[PDB]
Amino acid sequence: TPDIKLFGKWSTDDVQINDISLQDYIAVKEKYAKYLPHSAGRYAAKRFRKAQCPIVERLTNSMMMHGRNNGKKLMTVRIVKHAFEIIHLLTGENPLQVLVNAIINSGPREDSTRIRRQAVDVSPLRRVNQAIWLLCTGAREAAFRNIKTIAECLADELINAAKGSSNSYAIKKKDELERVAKSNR
Amino acid sequence: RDKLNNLVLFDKATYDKLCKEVPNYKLITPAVVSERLKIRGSLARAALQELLSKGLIKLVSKHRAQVIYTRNTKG
Amino acid sequence: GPLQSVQVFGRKKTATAVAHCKRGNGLIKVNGRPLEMIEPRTLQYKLLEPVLLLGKERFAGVDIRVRVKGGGHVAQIYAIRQSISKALVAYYQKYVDEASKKEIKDILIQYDRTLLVADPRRCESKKFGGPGARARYQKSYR
Amino acid sequence: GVTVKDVNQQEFVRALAAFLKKSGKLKVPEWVDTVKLAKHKELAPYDENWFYTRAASTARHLYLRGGAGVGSMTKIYGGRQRNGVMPSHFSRGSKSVARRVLQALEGLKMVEKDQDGGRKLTPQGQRDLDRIAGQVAAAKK
Amino acid sequence: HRIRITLTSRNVKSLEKVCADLIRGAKEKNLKVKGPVRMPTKTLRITTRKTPCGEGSKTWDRFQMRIHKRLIDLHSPSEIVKQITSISIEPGVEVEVTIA
Amino acid sequence: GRVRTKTVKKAARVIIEKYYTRLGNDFHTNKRVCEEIAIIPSKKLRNKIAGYVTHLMKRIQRGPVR
Amino acid sequence: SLVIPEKFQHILRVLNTNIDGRRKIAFAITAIKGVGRRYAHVVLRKADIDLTKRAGELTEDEVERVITIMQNPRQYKIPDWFLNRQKDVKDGKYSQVLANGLDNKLREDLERLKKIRAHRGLRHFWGLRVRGQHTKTTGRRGRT
Amino acid sequence: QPIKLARVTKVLGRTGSQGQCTQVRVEFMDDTSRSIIRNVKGPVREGDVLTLLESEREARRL
RNA sequence: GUUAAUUCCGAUAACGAACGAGACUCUGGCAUGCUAACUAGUUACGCGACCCCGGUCGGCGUAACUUCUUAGAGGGACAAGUGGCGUUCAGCCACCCGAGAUUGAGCAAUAACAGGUCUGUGAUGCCCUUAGAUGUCCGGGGCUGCACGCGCGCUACACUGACUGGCUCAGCGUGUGCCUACCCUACGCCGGCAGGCGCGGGUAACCCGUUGAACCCCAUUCGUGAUGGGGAUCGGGGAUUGCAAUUAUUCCCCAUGAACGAGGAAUUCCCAGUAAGUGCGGGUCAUAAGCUUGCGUUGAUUAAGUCCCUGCCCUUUGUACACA
Ligand SMILES: [Mg+2]
Ligand SMILES: [Mg+2]
Ligand SMILES: [Mg+2]
Ligand SMILES: [Mg+2]
Ligand SMILES: [Mg+2]
Ligand SMILES: [Mg+2]
Ligand SMILES: [Mg+2]
Ligand SMILES: [Mg+2]
Ligand SMILES: [Mg+2]
């Protein structure tokens, strides 16, 4: 059937990926459109099959961290649902488009490594992975020991990062990573 | 280092403080309302629940972990 | 008149779900309970993948009763998903031309392969000297 | 023609509990407030009228699977017991609540002691549960 | 005249040999049989430290022991079956006779 | 690492010289040829012998093998 | 409804202890020694008090009814097995011991055992564990 | 200083102390003829695009 | 050159061999094809119950059958097919079809260590003692003792949570004993609980038992407060096992409510049904798991590399070392 739309409400179509470096490492489009961010797996068998995972599933997997909630997918699936509900009603557009823009603006574009350190550029896949990882860990440390719940801490983290506010945790880490690599150049 | 002192029941100054602009928030949850008014979450849950009964806010999603409110349609 | 009965099973980790498909009028029940209330309800669109990707008209004329046993909450959900998809394809093979099987099989496969082919992975045994299959206890040099 | 299996069970219990309370023949015991519902709990049930809900719940279970006794009821109402610093285990429910609720539902003709042991749903009881299922279906639709 | 014979053995190759012999012996004496029902295999497991002393890497031994059980029922009186069961038994296989 | 040991290569090289006419080009038929013409005590090296025999056919068809 | 009452008390002074008024009544009573999370709950169900109310919101007469029930549990059908000074060693009376009297009986029991040189009394006198725990490797920072 | 982005054509090999960074040759799609050798961190495929903040440094071959 | 491999190809004063590796056994996956199933089921049929012809029924009974269950025999996968790379050899990468294109274990060489075990042994040399005994039994105590240091762990620091209700899913596997005492439990009454009293089944695919397990899911209360987080320490009372529990065996109830707000230098384990969370069995067991051995269950981030660190293997090389 056509118009496969996430949670039965969010249409995956009309989501544009402006950056061409991350065309084929982001899975949101018609072939990769599903109803839920839950799926069987087999996505870790080969090396580059990791990039064929729908990115909402990738975000969902990365929220199951810090011990207490390993192997709790349904709780995180619920978390993303409510996060997408209030990204829509707070900004007024498709939550999927906000998430895609958050990934692009968050992933670092050059990192430092030991070859005293040497500055190297990052591959598109690791650019996506650090984008997802930074967004989740920013929400996790914001919601800890605080009255505000996890679902909106993730939501406002995405909204801040989608605009490149430099107030979000993810953008602050991105600027710190590249500026150090700038010095090590 | 910093301590929160949230009142458990509305004073008269804060009660209408809620009744005026809170029905114009884009995103109405007990979490956001609790810290915009420095109130207990239980009071925020009760205060938000009685506004729906009157009908000046509309429910968008209800769940155990989170309840989410917005304001009515414009005009 | 003649009975058109097809019984097809579905597999997950350990949950096996076998679906009895007859000629009916579009009734779907799991252990006597319709698909709309099967806990967990958060994974409810999963039970509705085979139906919603195809529409009622292909599921019209057949009545499916699924019995499920074994496994866990999520494992049983995936077993029913595969069982309904396999049973409907097996029904269209035996009593309809496979010209009908062709497009029905491709639309399911193109969505995901596990909806018709069983996932072969299973839990592996624990080895001694560790708490699990591969984790070990702490070394204590000093 | 609706049935218990068709309607959602969570509000079926709440609907049937109200039926028992408005009827007012259940013969609740006198220690319903000072009792702790299981050894693994920590506090008395928050709802003051839990006995009507528990009676509603156990009638639903005898409807689905019959031949259940007190040992079956204390097993089905068990849960995780937290032992402090020790690891948590499984502990069975309270027996006395199982007996009094089962006998309460037996005083007014809902269940009866069938052969092979335990209780099962009396044909009159099967009608009353099917009555409430109709009420649940109509309200939700 | 409802009899059942229980075949239990640790060795399964000879167990299927003995079981096939009795059915063929029954079929040649034209009495109906309900075929061998293969009940689940009971595995006996003992796990023990390899070492007599206390030291060494904590290695363990897994000793198994499987028990295979088969059942044969017959449409016959006791005299015919006695001369069937009295012959062709592997020393591993043990057989009991009961009247149902 | 699918390298065939000596006990597979030696068996195949003996079979090819003594039964060249009977062997074919597909794996499945000459798998049955090898099974009946030599006593191979299990399936796995029966397949591995038959698989190497099939591989040797194509080399032989193109030209000589030392 | 949600507007603060004119007589709302932030602290209630009862049994020579303070009771916070911003806390739920069921958990506000627990602040005095001799009552826990569960003794409080049954007490304010014998006295018909709305659980949803708070300690600073209930009026005085219904407060003083609680103390009468708390100090006199038996006369209001509180079960015998539910007390903490059941069948004491002096007057054999099943009573509920509360904030100030709890420290007096605890002291009396410790010197009762120590007086006659019972083993449990000696360990209390020496400041050591009394319930058979291993003292080799645990409970160290208290003992230097 | 504008940002240039380029595509990989082939993978030379793994370099770095722990062998954690891959050395590749890329061409800029603006000038499809000029090619440069650079060290990239992360799993890199053949035929994907790298976003170069600085494009006039050139890494040595191993 | 190739391989996980002294694995092969190929060179060749070596030729033909042996062990190890591999092969092998068990295990996982899949077969609507076969053998069959009242100690396993399905579907039909006939009654029965309920609801508005139909629907539900682990309610009852029987006619066919083996899909689900069980366990036997075979089958199936071989780098076989296609495209590249390569002495065009051994082989490597990708793709199709496929259930599967590296499942996990068991066994396991020569030579050695003055590694552990004389406290497993009626395996044992020599020495010691042997009647006021280092024999054996009985009574009592200790092996648990507490200024301190270290190792393996359990529970936590909370809201991705705690509490109270409701709903809904397993897989291993044990069970009445040679002496030997001690089994797993259904159901019905009493008790708030631990538990008690009666009847019954089971030597077990037959009964416990459709093993209604936890996490998880849905609905309440709490509101950033060492707080309904946490449950140490400790007082009082009640049971159970035992010949006896005090130095509290274990369990139940009320009360008491400590440190702990993520952990320094340093360091451990691990890459797919894997880590981690979660519970259930067995061993120990009169009393009984914070241990260990297995079982399922929910279920990932990262990586398909390297020799920088710690080490192992091969060749060349240097040595004043050879208990190295
Ligand atoms: Mg929070
Ligand atoms: Mg339960
Ligand atoms: Mg020595
Ligand atoms: Mg001497
Ligand atoms: Mg000791
Ligand atoms: Mg506290
Ligand atoms: Mg607590
Ligand atoms: Mg031990
Ligand atoms: Mg020199």
Side-chain angles (χ1 to χ4, degrees):
Chain A
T1 186
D3 71 8
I4 301 299
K5 70 172 56 45
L6 185 63
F7 305 111
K9 184 165 71 175
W10 310 125
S11 67
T12 68
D13 201 349
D14 291 331
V15 173
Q16 287 69 240
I17 305 192
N18 58 6
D19 187 325
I20 61 170
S21 174
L22 317 164
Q23 294 297 109
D24 62 358
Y25 289 81
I26 301 299
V28 297
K29 299 301 290 184
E30 69 275 16
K31 185 180 184 295
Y32 300 96
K34 317 294 173 174
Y35 289 86
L36 298 169
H38 186 276
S39 179
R42 291 287 88 189
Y43 280 10
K46 298 293 178 67
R47 186 151 79 122
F48 290 126
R49 269 217 277 280
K50 201 200 265 183
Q52 293 179 356
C53 198
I55 196 166
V56 301
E57 191 148 354
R58 271 172 81 70
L59 182 66
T60 304
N61 287 1
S62 177
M63 302 285 329
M64 313 152 61
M65 293 180 183
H66 266 70
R68 297 181 295 172
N69 53 10
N70 302 126
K72 293 181 182 177
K73 183 69 73 69
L74 278 70
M75 182 179 72
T76 69
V77 171
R78 170 203 99 218
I79 278 158
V80 188
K81 203 168 92 141
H82 306 328
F84 272 10
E85 286 307 4
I86 61 175
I87 289 169
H88 182 198
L89 64 89
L90 179 50
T91 63
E93 69 275 16
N94 196 321
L96 273 298
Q97 186 60 72
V98 179
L99 193 152
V100 169
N101 291 326
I103 298 299
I104 296 169
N105 295 117
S106 179
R109 291 177 292 178
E110 66 182 1
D111 177 27
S112 179
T113 190
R114 177 64 176 85
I115 190 73
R116 193 269 300 161
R117 297 178 67 186
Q118 183 62 255
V120 300
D121 43 19
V122 296
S123 61
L125 182 61
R126 202 209 163 72
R127 186 180 178 184
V128 164
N129 296 10
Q130 292 299 110
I132 287 277
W133 183 84
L134 286 164
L135 296 176
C136 294
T137 186
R140 185 169 308 111
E141 61 86 20
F144 202 55
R145 306 200 46 219
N146 192 355
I147 176 70
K148 62 181 71 175
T149 183
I150 185 66
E152 62 86 20
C153 284
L154 173 59
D156 69 23
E157 184 53 27
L158 265 46
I159 297 168
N160 275 3
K163 294 186 287 185
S165 175
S166 186
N167 198 341
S168 64
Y169 172 94
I171 298 286
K172 292 183 180 181
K173 299 299 294 296
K174 179 180 178 180
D175 306 355
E176 187 92 344
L177 278 166
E178 293 179 353
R179 75 150 280 270
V180 164
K182 187 269 183 181
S183 67
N184 290 317
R185 185 146 58 219
Chain B
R1 301 90 183 169
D2 54 352
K3 186 64 64 68
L4 279 72
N5 202 67
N6 290 318
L7 73 165
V8 301
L9 285 150
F10 282 136
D11 69 16
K12 183 57 66 178
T14 309
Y15 182 52
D16 63 358
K17 180 68 173 66
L18 179 144
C19 296
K20 300 289 94 176
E21 72 274 14
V22 161
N24 296 115
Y25 284 10
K26 297 296 289 183
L27 188 151
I28 297 169
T29 71
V32 72
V33 163
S34 179
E35 61 86 20
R36 296 292 299 274
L37 309 188
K38 277 74 69 177
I39 62 170
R40 298 288 187 89
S42 52
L43 172 71
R45 287 185 289 113
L48 294 197
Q49 186 174 0
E50 61 86 20
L51 295 176
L52 187 150
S53 62
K54 310 199 280 202
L56 55 86
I57 58 187
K58 67 182 290 294
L59 182 65
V60 63
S61 86
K62 180 67 174 66
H63 179 285
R64 174 180 85 269
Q66 185 161 28
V67 59
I68 309 180
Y69 295 99
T70 81
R71 66 184 183 273
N72 296 86
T73 63
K74 324 314 162 196
Chain C
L3 60 89
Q4 277 166 18
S5 173
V6 176
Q7 278 201 318
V8 177
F9 64 93
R11 287 286 197 269
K12 196 57 176 73
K13 294 183 183 181
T14 318
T16 182
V18 65
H20 183 223
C21 181
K22 296 189 292 183
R23 185 178 63 247
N25 309 305
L27 184 146
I28 307 298
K29 291 183 183 294
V30 174
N31 292 113
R33 301 178 70 179
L35 288 197
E36 293 82 3
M37 72 291 291
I38 298 296
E39 293 83 3
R41 288 183 292 112
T42 180
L43 295 175
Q44 190 161 93
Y45 269 131
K46 287 280 187 262
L47 281 74
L48 277 71
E49 313 289 26
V51 169
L52 188 57
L53 270 68
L54 280 72
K56 281 277 169 315
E57 69 275 16
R58 292 180 182 177
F59 287 88
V62 291
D63 280 340
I64 297 170
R65 305 216 179 65
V66 181
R67 66 199 181 258
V68 187
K69 183 174 71 68
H73 280 320
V74 179
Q76 290 189 178
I77 292 297
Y78 273 141
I80 307 176
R81 220 169 73 93
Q82 176 179 214
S83 71
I84 297 169
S85 297
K86 287 175 69 175
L88 176 77
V89 171
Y91 183 86
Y92 272 18
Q93 188 191 304
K94 198 204 217 163
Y95 296 131
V96 185
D97 59 354
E98 66 183 1
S100 183
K101 177 194 280 187
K102 182 67 181 294
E103 69 275 16
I104 192 163
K105 185 176 283 188
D106 291 331
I107 190 167
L108 270 67
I109 285 297
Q110 188 274 331
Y111 180 86
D112 62 358
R113 178 185 190 249
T114 189
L115 192 67
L116 293 174
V117 178
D119 202 15
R121 72 171 84 94
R122 296 296 208 281
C123 296
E124 60 165 274
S125 65
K126 184 183 103 52
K127 315 315 180 303
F128 62 87
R134 276 159 147 138
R136 308 286 102 209
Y137 302 128
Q138 295 297 109
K139 294 295 290 293
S140 182
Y141 296 117
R142 287 183 288 262
Chain D
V2 298
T3 310
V4 172
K5 303 292 287 295
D6 175 341
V7 310
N8 186 359
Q9 305 300 273
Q10 268 201 291
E11 69 275 16
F12 177 90
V13 175
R14 282 189 276 95
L16 164 71
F19 178 76
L20 287 202
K21 203 181 163 102
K22 67 180 289 294
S23 65
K25 277 74 69 177
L26 212 61
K27 168 267 207 183
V28 310
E30 69 275 16
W31 40 257
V32 298
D33 69 299
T34 186
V35 68
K36 186 174 71 173
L37 215 50
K39 65 183 287 185
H40 65 85
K41 301 294 184 181
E42 293 179 353
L43 310 160
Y46 173 80
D47 182 46
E48 191 67 290
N49 319 316
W50 55 267
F51 193 96
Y52 290 129
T53 298
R54 190 48 81 80
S57 179
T58 181
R60 197 180 70 67
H61 280 285
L62 287 176
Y63 170 79
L64 299 178
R65 182 201 290 195
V70 168
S72 196
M73 289 304 174
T74 187
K75 165 142 89 163
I76 190 171
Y77 285 122
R80 186 179 69 187
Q81 172 183 324
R82 295 179 67 250
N83 297 43
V85 303
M86 308 270 285
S88 73
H89 285 343
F90 174 88
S91 88
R92 295 178 65 88
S94 192
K95 293 181 181 179
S96 293
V97 188
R99 286 188 290 112
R100 310 314 279 294
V101 178
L102 268 184
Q103 293 174 354
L105 272 161
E106 183 178 1
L108 55 91
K109 277 73 69 177
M110 294 299 291
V111 303
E112 86 292 359
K113 304 165 163 213
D114 61 354
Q115 69 276 17
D116 297 329
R119 325 301 163 92
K120 72 178 180 182
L121 203 71
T122 301
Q124 189 45 15
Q126 186 174 2
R127 170 200 326 271
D128 291 331
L129 271 66
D130 276 4
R131 292 285 188 267
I132 301 299
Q135 295 298 109
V136 172
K140 68 181 178 67
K141 69 182 290 294
Chain E
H1 285 321
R2 296 307 63 178
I3 71 166
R4 194 160 37 189
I5 58 171
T6 62
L7 278 71
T8 63
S9 176
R10 292 144 43 171
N11 204 351
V12 67
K13 297 297 181 182
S14 65
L15 185 67
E16 298 281 60
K17 180 263 291 180
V18 174
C19 188
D21 291 331
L22 294 174
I23 313 291
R24 292 183 291 113
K27 296 297 291 296
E28 57 88 16
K29 291 180 178 67
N30 63 13
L31 56 90
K32 66 94 176 178
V33 298
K34 270 206 288 203
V37 300
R38 293 181 181 90
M39 294 177 70
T41 300
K42 290 181 182 291
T43 302
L44 294 174
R45 292 180 179 91
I46 304 296
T47 309
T48 289
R49 285 286 290 284
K50 288 184 180 290
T51 187
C53 63
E55 80 158 9
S57 313
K58 278 73 177 174
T59 48
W60 291 78
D61 271 318
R62 321 185 184 65
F63 297 93
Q64 304 209 10
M65 183 177 177
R66 290 188 177 95
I67 307 187
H68 310 266
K69 186 183 285 187
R70 314 256 188 280
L71 300 175
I72 307 299
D73 65 37
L74 302 180
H75 204 69
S76 175
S78 187
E79 67 276 13
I80 294 150
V81 302
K82 182 63 69 177
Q83 55 82 28
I84 309 170
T85 61
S86 297
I87 63 170
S88 81
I89 59 168
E90 188 71 29
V93 192
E94 52 165 83
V95 176
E96 293 83 3
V97 298
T98 60
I99 318 303
Chain F
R2 311 225 192 180
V3 172
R4 275 78 69 90
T5 68
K6 66 174 75 67
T7 175
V8 160
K9 290 184 184 292
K10 291 181 181 179
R13 282 202 280 262
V14 160
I15 290 168
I16 190 167
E17 66 183 1
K18 292 173 72 174
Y19 298 95
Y20 178 69
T21 61
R22 295 179 69 185
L23 294 174
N25 189 359
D26 71 4
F27 167 70
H28 299 269
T29 300
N30 59 8
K31 156 184 91 203
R32 297 271 198 269
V33 177
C34 276
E35 183 178 1
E36 61 86 20
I37 203 64
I39 53 170
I40 311 177
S42 66
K43 289 170 69 176
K44 286 178 72 174
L45 73 165
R46 184 201 90 209
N47 282 342
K48 292 170 75 174
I49 288 170
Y52 195 46
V53 170
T54 300
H55 180 88
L56 269 188
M57 295 298 103
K58 294 180 175 65
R59 284 198 64 203
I60 289 277
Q61 183 62 255
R62 292 182 292 110
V65 175
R66 185 179 67 189
Chain G
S1 59
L2 317 177
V3 298
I4 188 165
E6 69 278 15
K7 59 95 177 180
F8 183 80
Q9 296 103 349
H10 295 98
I11 287 176
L12 292 75
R13 193 65 143 91
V14 69
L15 271 299
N16 299 326
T17 77
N18 324 302
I19 296 300
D20 186 74
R22 295 179 292 113
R23 189 183 293 267
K24 299 296 292 295
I25 183 62
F27 295 93
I29 296 170
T30 65
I32 79 175
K33 282 173 64 82
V35 66
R37 289 188 296 272
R38 182 168 169 83
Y39 182 76
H41 270 101
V42 74
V43 164
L44 68 94
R45 291 186 186 273
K46 299 289 94 176
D48 307 278
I49 293 171
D50 183 73
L51 270 292
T52 308
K53 295 172 30 65
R54 276 172 145 82
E57 184 176 302
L58 73 165
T59 180
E60 309 72 23
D61 47 313
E62 65 183 1
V63 183
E64 61 86 20
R65 187 169 55 241
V66 174
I67 297 89
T68 61
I69 294 171
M70 293 177 71
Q71 293 179 356
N72 266 352
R74 294 176 65 88
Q75 293 82 17
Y76 293 71
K77 275 71 67 179
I78 297 298
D80 204 62
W81 40 272
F82 183 76
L83 279 62
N84 44 295
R85 181 59 63 185
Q86 301 175 0
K87 187 177 179 179
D88 63 358
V89 298
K90 299 289 94 176
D91 79 356
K93 297 296 289 183
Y94 296 69
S95 74
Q96 173 54 253
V97 185
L98 289 145
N100 189 359
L102 194 150
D103 291 331
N104 313 133
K105 288 184 183 293
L106 180 62
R107 186 274 304 278
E108 190 277 331
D109 291 331
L110 301 195
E111 61 86 20
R112 178 179 178 270
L113 282 152
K114 180 174 67 67
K115 187 182 288 184
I116 58 173
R117 302 292 299 276
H119 180 256
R120 180 152 38 120
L122 270 56
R123 315 266 306 172
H124 276 164
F125 187 45
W126 303 333
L128 288 157
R129 293 281 163 80
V130 297
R131 292 184 180 180
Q133 304 97 303
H134 294 210
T135 45
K136 185 175 180 179
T137 69
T138 66
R140 274 171 173 182
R141 88 290 186 275
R143 59 206 183 191
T144 297
Chain H
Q1 199 43 260
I3 173 170
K4 297 288 98 178
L5 61 83
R7 179 185 308 71
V8 173
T9 51
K10 67 181 262 174
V11 173
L12 277 296
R14 313 286 291 241
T15 187
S17 81
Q18 285 76 241
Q20 68 287 352
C21 64
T22 303
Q23 188 172 5
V24 300
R25 295 179 66 250
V26 300
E27 70 276 16
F28 298 81
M29 283 73 74
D30 55 65
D31 188 358
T32 48
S33 83
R34 65 182 294 275
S35 292
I36 190 167
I37 297 89
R38 294 183 68 88
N39 293 320
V40 64
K41 180 175 174 65
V44 68
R45 194 210 298 285
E46 190 277 331
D48 70 45
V49 182
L50 299 176
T51 187
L52 277 296
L53 315 183
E54 190 276 331
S55 64
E56 293 82 3
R57 185 179 67 189
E58 190 276 331
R60 83 291 184 276
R61 89 289 182 276
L62 73 165

